[PDB]
Amino acid sequence: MDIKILKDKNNSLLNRRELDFVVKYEGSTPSRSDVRNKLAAMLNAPLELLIIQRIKTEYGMQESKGYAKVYADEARMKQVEQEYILKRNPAPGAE
Amino acid sequence: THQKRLSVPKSWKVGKKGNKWISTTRPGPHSQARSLPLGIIIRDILKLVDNSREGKRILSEGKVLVDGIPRKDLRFPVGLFDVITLPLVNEAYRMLQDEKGRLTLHKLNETNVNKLCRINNKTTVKGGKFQLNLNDGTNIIGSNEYGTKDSLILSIPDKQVVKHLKFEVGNLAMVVGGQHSGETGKIMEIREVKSSRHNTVMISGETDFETIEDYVIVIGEDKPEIRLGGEISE
Amino acid sequence: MRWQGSSRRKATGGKVITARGKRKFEMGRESAETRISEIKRKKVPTMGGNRKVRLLQSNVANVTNPKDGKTVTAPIETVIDNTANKHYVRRNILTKGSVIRTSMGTARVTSRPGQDGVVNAVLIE
Amino acid sequence: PGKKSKSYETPKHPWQEARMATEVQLVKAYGLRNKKEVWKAASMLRMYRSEARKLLAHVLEGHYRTQSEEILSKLIRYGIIKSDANIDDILSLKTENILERRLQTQVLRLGLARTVIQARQFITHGHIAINGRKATIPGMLVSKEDEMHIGYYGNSPLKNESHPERP
Amino acid sequence: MAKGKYAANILKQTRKDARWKDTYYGRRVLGLNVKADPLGGAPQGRGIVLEKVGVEAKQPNSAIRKCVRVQLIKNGRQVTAFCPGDGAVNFIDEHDEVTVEKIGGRMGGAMGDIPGVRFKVIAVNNVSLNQLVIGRMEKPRR
RNA sequence: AUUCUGGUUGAUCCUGCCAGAGGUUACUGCUAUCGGUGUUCGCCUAAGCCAUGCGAGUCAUAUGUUCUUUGUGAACAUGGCGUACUGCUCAGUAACACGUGGAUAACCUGCCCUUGGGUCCGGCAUAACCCCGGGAAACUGGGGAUAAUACCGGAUAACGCACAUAUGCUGGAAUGCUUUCUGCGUAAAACGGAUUCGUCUGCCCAAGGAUGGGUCUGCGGCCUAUCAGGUAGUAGUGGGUGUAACGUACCUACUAGCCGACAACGGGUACGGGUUGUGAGAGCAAGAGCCCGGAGAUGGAUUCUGAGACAUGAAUCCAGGCCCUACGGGGCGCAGCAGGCGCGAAAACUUUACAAUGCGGGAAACCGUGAUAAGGGGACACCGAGUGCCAGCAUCAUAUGCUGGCUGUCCGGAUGUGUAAAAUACAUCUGUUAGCAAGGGCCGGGCAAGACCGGUGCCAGCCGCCGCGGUAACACCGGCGGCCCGAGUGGUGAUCGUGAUUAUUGGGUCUAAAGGGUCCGUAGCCGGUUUGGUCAGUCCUCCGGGAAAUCUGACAGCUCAACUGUUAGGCUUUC
Ligand SMILES: [Mg+2]
Structure with a gap:
């Protein structure tokens, strides 16, 4: 599974970073935890800190x-x- | 106090998508026809908050200011020439009416800048006061030098007078309606044509025409005193 | 209560068929006529928290001399006459445009007591 | 209210012999399925024809130049008319160009399948793609620029050239 | 029919009067069709069968046309209904619930060589009488 | 595609309709895989009647009380705001109700808005709680304690009379604001709450705005004469009355008008418009749904509360039906959401969630939301797909053959994306002997299809119309075969077109239906050449408008598609 990131605007009014990227996955659409684990290394964001809102995969080509x-x-x-x-974003040790 | 997706005003540039109501603006100081919610502004134009809850949170936390006043309500109206200031990026935007009569936003350069208003009815508050029918900010209850339609300029957020931009023949003028909205140009002849409806005015910028006196703004002496047009960011 | 809605035919005599009920904003109160008695008033409310003062009885007036423009309060004794109704003179009703008799002199009522809350009469010259 | 009626039209008399013969010939040649497909293709044809009539009535004005050039630009984008075409060339427009812009016709004349219906089933069964898009629509309307990038899908078995039914 | 420039009123009046000579527009505006027909604009109906009559056909032709006599429940109107198909009276008898519809003939009126009959059966006990005539449905015992 | 075809005749021309042929709408027979789009699914009968749940509630930074799960945690009470906005229905209404242009200098406005001020003394009930209950219930009594932004009483304005005082707006234009002050009657608030003591939010007030709504009038839009007079508060003047405000809206004195034959009054019908149907167009027909305004809450009247109501989740009574009772009494009306009975040709789940969009509540954190979104169900309207593909080979030229393989759009599974969470959709994989997935009408003409074989014998039947059968039925019934359409395909209305069969465009009227017996003649309508003047219709142009929505085209983005946004046009019209 592959990822390329394009937009990283930071909202000054909340002190948060908006991560926008293209998911070049293969075959099976990766789960939210897996995409978080891959997206963490791109900008040095912990799993508890890095948060993903959607990994929405389109028709046909394996891009999300x-x-x-x-x-x-x-x-x-x-x-x-x-x-x-x-709840949807599992914390370290979450259940 | 609702308004629906289809019956959104003609001055509202935002489309007809969604489900019925789109963020009913308050009564407010400005007219509801030329008004947009501050929540709709911050959720559609600038794109600093996407949800209505997060927008209400950011407004409630004193992060956005409208002429130095950090309004906590997402339903506050906005009129023409209104300045929105965000100190955290030094983002300044001004409410403007484009050529189709819709309200947009132009980015400014400096955080600190004046705001322009207009005179509509000079009445006399008891106590020897010449009330100018002010609606926003502080001002000066002045004298007969301040006539009707004089288009006063005032600072922010203290709202003190900067320069009396009194109109005459040849002075600058900005249109605020019709098919000529945004075609700022020099005044040619302000004829006091007596009639039951209202008088008229002659204005020519790039091209000459006739325009109505309620669709003219005395926006400068010869050149723009205020930061009229910066960057048209959606 | 009285109905002041637009109900009197059209122009011809064709009876207007009402498409709407008696609305709340069209309901007018009763003509609280004023007479010469102990000075009695009521703070009847109206729309938007406007308690209009309604007078009912009064034997005093604010007679206003026109020669010197001096306002002095003198008692009301009798209504001399009235253009509006020929019966209010017999009834001693105090309507606007009537003529009262005071101690200062004959005067004409120039205030509507049912709306003003006082009996302001201009002293006739 | 705000609803919508049909797109195609219908014949006033529905059993014209030569007209039905031409319909069946076009359907069998281009690998179509419904008579209404030919009817809607002719309805797009008469849309372009009626726009041409509306423009050519005036014989091109400050805003009619835009209304008369936008349709020509779109058709040159889609290539239903000649590349060096004018407004008047749309008036002599037959429905073979419209059927040619259909993706089944395009793949049939790109030699990606032996027969037209095999082109139909190959397009629907993900065997025709464009730059990664696994489009499965015979009714897809493509450009001349769209035509070059078309090929087998990277996941479909015909990307491997071992297919015996494939040439 | 005045051809002057300022003569729209006369042409409007003469078109207004001449429109009434058409049967269709006058009968539509006057509401004779709603006032006349038993269904009252309902495309079909539902009546209780009472008597069965094999009414005769026209003069040149010769036949017996099976026509039940049915009284509607929506309006209580007594009419005659023609039951089509071979074995037509076999699937309908007295005191039934049968849907009825117009015969769809000349001007909406009686069709063919059937005199005085304008209504036809379309279903017996809310099931299609056409399929009973064909033989793909069976008559309920109700 | 600006369309013709059969029928009156022994045969022709023709007037003339009938019927055929295409939409759309409503309903429905037969029948059937799926996805997309959104603005459809008890309107047409019964605005009939309703069991059940629910739809508006919120306020700890207003006051007061008991716990603790110690926290903007919950329960009770006083109190503030809100519930008059949404939502539903489409009866009434032929009307300033509505569309549209003006007006309000004739008016009210809680929340919100900016400036100018102020925020002053007090008084002290009554709540939950305590003690006893009454009551079938609905409800609800007494004594004891007490608080607030509760409520009452007092000082500095507004309101009305009369004055003098300078352009302040608007401006044909004071009649308003007013510098005003004068004296005569004549008033408010909570120095409340919290804090980081920085400040934030509330009370009163004046001016204005904005918002909401009342009022007002130029103009635009039904059938009817087998509907000719209608109107007395009706038309108007003065003076009043009440009103938020103008007003016969009511009252008084008076005048004798007002509307109508260019259609008053009455009857018929109807929610109005934006628009929709259809046609080449002129037009013609309907304006259920999405948005704007109107009205209605079982029929009806009346009223409290409030800034605002005569309130869909307020009351009161009458009519009407129904209902709980311990028989002394007490409720209710789903045209709010699902649902039920009734009704009929005529339509769904008593699902899900506040995640989003809004609304009220809160200072805030946040809570409620049958609004909204999300689905379930209904051959709603549109759009997109597939049930096959396939080389070689054979007869009767397209059917199953014989064989060869090959694909998974469908169906089933896995797994994740995904939504509040689902489901579909979405991606890989893979399940299939390609088998599970096609029907519906019709076959004499009109009109595309059989002069093939038995049946029946003016019978059974068909038949929109024409026309068939009393013995050789391409006609009717099964078959065989064939035809058209396509997850659709027919039926009956309706309605448009056909039809120049309503005709201004655009018809006829000697003999086919049709010139009035003739004639005189008003409104209407049509009008000679001509000089002089105007420019109202008209004309070119300008400026204020004519909401979006739907319409057209393209671009952009949904895989193509319909669809959403930008944009150039259309309509809005005919001010
Ligand atoms: Mg009141």
């Missing part, structure tokens, strides 16, 4: 849209991000 995000605080994520995103 990844709208990931980065925060300088997990409490900031819990204050801003929705609870379904926090």
Whole structure:
């Protein structure tokens, strides 16, 4: 599975990084944890800190849209991000 | 106090997508016809917050200012020539009406800049005051030098007078309606044509024409005193 | 309560068939007529928190001399006459445009007591 | 309300012998399925023809130049008319160009399948792609620029050239 | 029919009066069709069969046309209904529930050599009488 | 594609309709794999009646009380705001109701907005709680304690009279604001709450705006004469009354008008428009759904509360039906969402979630939301696909053959993307002997298809129309065969076109239906050449408008597609 990132705008009004990238996966659309693990090494973002909102794969060609995000605080994520995103994004040791 | 997707105003540039209501603007100081929500502005034009909840959060946390006033409500109206200031990037934007009568935003350079208003009805508050029918900011309750339609300029956020931009024959003028919106040009003849409706005005910039006095803004002496046009960012 | 809605035929006598009910904003109150008695008023409310003062009885007036422009309060004794109704003179009703009799002199009521809350009468010259 | 009626048209008398013969010949030649497909292709044809009539009535004005050039630019994009064409060339437009712009016709004349219906099944069964897009639509409307990049899909078995039914 | 420039009123009046001589427009505006027909604009109906009559055909032709006599429940209107197909009276008897529809003949009226009959059966006990005539459905015992 | 075909005749021309042929709409017979788009699915009968759940609730930074899971955590009470906005329905309404252009200098506005001020003394109930209950319930009593942005009382304005005082707007234009002050009657607030004591948010007030709504009038749009007079508060003047405000809206004195034959009054019908159907167009027909305005809440009247209502989740009574009762009494009306009975030709789940978009609540964190979104179900409308492909070989030229393999768009599975979470969709893989996935009408003419074989004998039947059968039925029934359409295909209405069969464009009227018996003659309508003047229709042009939506084309983006955004046009019209 392969990833290339294009847009990394940082919102000054919240102190978070907007991660936009193209998922050049092969065959099976990768899960959110796997895409987070791959996207972490591209910009030095921990799993608890790096957050992804969608890995949306298109028809036909094995290319997907990844709208990931980065925060300088997990409490900031819990204050801003929705609870379904926090559940959907597995924390270190999460259940 | 609702408004629907289809019956969105003609001055609202945002499309007709979604599900019925699109962010009902308050009563506010400005007219509802030439007004956009600050939530809709920050969620469509600038793209600093995508959700309505996150927009309400960022507004409520004192992060966006409208002429130095950090409004916490996402339904605040915006009129023409309004300045939005964001200190964290030094992003300055001005409400402008393009050639189709719609409201857009032009980016400015400096964070600190004046705002332009206009005179609409000079009344007399009791106490020897010449009330100018002000609607926003602070001002000066002045004298008979301040006539109707004089298009005063005032600082931000203290809103003190910078320069009385009184109109005469030949002075600059910006259109605020019709098919000539945004075609700023010099005044040619401001004729006080007596009639039951309202008077008229002659203006010619790039091309000459006749325009109505309620569709003219006295926006400068000979050149733009305010930062009229910067960068048209969607 | 009275109905002040637009209900009196069209121009011809064709009876107007109402398509709407008696709306709340078309309901007018009763003509609280004023007489010569103990000075009595009521703070009836109206639209938008505007409690209009309605007078009912009064034997005093604010007679206003026109010769010197001096306003002095003198008692009302009798309505001399009235152009509006020939019966209010007999009833001692105090409507605007009537003529009262005071201690200062004969005066004409120049204020509507049912809307003004006072009886302001101009002293006739 | 705001709903939509059909796209194609219908004959006033529905059993014209020579007209039905031409319809069956076009359907069998180009590998079509429905009579309404030919009807809708002729409806796009008469759309271009009616736009041509509306423009050619005036005989090109400050804004009619735009309305008369945008259609010609789009058709040169799609190539239904000649490359060195004018407004008037659209008036003499037959539906073979429209059927040619159909992707089944394009793949049939690109030699990616022996027969037209085999081109149909190859396009629908992911055997025809364009730069990674596994498009499965016979009714796809492609450009001349679109035509060159067309090929087998990288996942479909015909990308490997071992197919016996394939040439 | 005045051809002057300022004569639109006369042409409008004379077109207004001449329109009434058409049967269709006058009968549409006057509402004779809604007032007349038992179904009242309903495309089909539902009536209780009462009596069965094999009514005769026209003068040149010669035949017996099986026509049930049915009274509607929506309106209580008594009419005559023609039951088509071979074995037509075999699948319908007295006191049934049968859908009825117009025969669809001349001007919406009676069709063919059937005199005085304008309604036809289309289904007996909410099942298609055409399929019973064909032989793909069976008559319910209800 | 600006379309013709059969029928009256022994045969022709023709007037003339009938029927044929295409849409669309409603309903429906037969029948059937799937996806996409969104603005459809109890309108047409019953605006009939409703069991059940639910749809508006929120406020710890207003006050007050008991716990703790110690936290903007919950329960109770006083109190503020909100529920008058959305949502539904389409009865009434032929109307300033509506579309559209103006007006309000004739008016009200809680929330919101900016500037100018102020935020002053007090008084002290009554809540939950305590003690006792009454009551079948609905409801709800007494005594004891007490608080607030609760409520009451007091000081500095507005309101109305009369004045003098300078352009301040608008400007034909004061009648308003007013510098005003004068005296005469004549008023408000919570120095509340929190804090990081930085400040934030609230109360009163004045001016204005904005928002909401009332009022107002030029103009635009039904059938009807087998509907000719209608109107007395009706038409108007003065003075009043009430109103938020103008007003016969009501009252008084008076005048004798007002509308109508260029259609008043009455009947018929109808939610209006944006628009929709259809046609080459002129037109013609309907305006259920998406948006704007209107009205309605079982029929009806009346009223409280509020800035705003005569309130869809307020009351009161009458009519009407129904309902819980311990028989003393007490409720209810789904034209709010699913659902039920009834009704009929005539339509769904008593699913999911506040994730988003909005709304009210909160200072905030946030909570509620049958609004909204998400689905389930209904041959809704449109669009896109597939059930086959396939070389070689054979007869009766396209059917199963014989054989050869080959693909997975469909169906089933796996796994992840994915949504609030689902499902579909989406990607790889892989399941298939390509087998599971086609029907529907019709075959004499009109009209594309059989003069092939038995049946029946003016019978059974067919038949939009024409026309068939009493003995050789290409006609009818099974068969055989064939034809057209296509997950669709027919039926009956309707309606448009056909049809120049309503004709201004664009028809006829000697003999086919049709010139009035003749004639005189008003409104209407049509009008000589000609000089002089105007420019109202008209003409070119300008400026204010004519909401979006839907329409057309393209671009951009959904895989093509329809569809969403930008944009150039259209309509909006005919001010
Ligand atoms: Mg009140």
